[PDB]
Subunit: 121 residues, 4 copies
């Protein structure tokens, strides 16, 4: 795959993901979150496994965003792991982990988990 991963996608919270997939598995772009201690665009970097497998499977991929930019520094980073499914309606179905930097004392509650579904709609 790689196919139509490039583009501007949006998730159910109204966040915008603008990405470019390189033919060798790299993903680059920017992220703008509609929620959280975030504002404006953030740099993202990831990878996607091409050469996926005939049995109409999705393409595994993942990316990271460290929430620091020239506007805010939320001392956290999020990683999204999921797969791309194309067709008439293409989607990127993910599960993410958002880790904030804590002291040892609070390390037990440093990580949130959630799921996001992206479309070009």
């Amino acid at each position: 795959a790689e196919a139509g991963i490039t583009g501007t996608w949006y998730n159910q919270l109204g966040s915008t993901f603008i990405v470019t997939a390189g033919a060798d598995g790299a993903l680059t772009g920017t992220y703008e979150s509609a929620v959280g201690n975030a504002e404006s665009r953030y740099v993202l970097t990831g990878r996607y496994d091409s050469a996926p497998a005939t049995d109409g499977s999705g393409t595994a991929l993942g990316w990271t965003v460290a929430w620091k930019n020239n506007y805010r520094n939320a001392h956290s980073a999020t990683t999204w792991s999921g797969q791309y499914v194309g067709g008439a309606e293409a989607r990127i179905n993910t599960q993410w982990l958002l880790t904030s930097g804590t002291t040892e004392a609070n390390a037990w509650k440093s990580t949130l988990v959630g799921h996001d579904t992206f479309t070009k709609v």
Copy 2:
């Protein structure tokens, strides 16, 4: 800090992580897994939040590895989210998500979750 993160790290499974942290919050390197449908090294890219806080908080970061290289293609990708704690014995504590590409029907069992702790080797 970039310097503290740059280096060779190993985790409890015997996997290897070689990374360099750029002043821009970038992370690039290779990962070698001791387990799984993997062989040789794989490229990794990630980011880390460059200006943490003062205090004794960890530095948040995350990176991704798509499990495809010249020797093998597992059709999966793993992302590690965690924090770096420097010091005499520095550690990177993480939780990860491993998604395999599946058909729509099997998408419910596409992701594995786990945690890994990495120890830095001297240098």
Copy 3:
């Protein structure tokens, strides 16, 4: 809350969750999965926090299903953690962990994570 948690709910995979909420926080019932190494009904037990909080929040709850019954024994168990939201369309939004029993060697890949949304529709 507790309100209308009792009932028969269904999720996006077509699984059926039949539960009874006791006024003291207990949840009891049976589960039938439309997918996996499962067949017929399985016993479930859980808890839900009542006395929830005015700011129209959901009610936190969770439950477990060990996948052994008189038909199959899949040597695994799933726990769903989420919150109930009622109203005209009530839903139970969850994230689950499915752990299978492995040898130490395979312990690194014993746990799957996912999300299910239940409705009475």
Copy 4:
């Protein structure tokens, strides 16, 4: 096995788990957390898969704790999913999900994820 699981267990944070495993695959007991918006004991209910396999596999199980008792109401619930490994030093290795009740708008940050390892105390 029911007998092996029944007992008092503690985890790395200093929390206490007292449980009894019924021959029907049931688990009942109390949990006391060393951290969080919690105080005193809380009731727990769960299940465990009674007939594991022969082999040196773990026994899968899980339990839930809603964080409400006579002294405090945190409006949250935690579920622990993991496996029991018996032996001279028995352990229960788990991963957990802690969901707080939120408004629809904040539902994206309602769940925390983590892992705990429990060690059995003699008796």
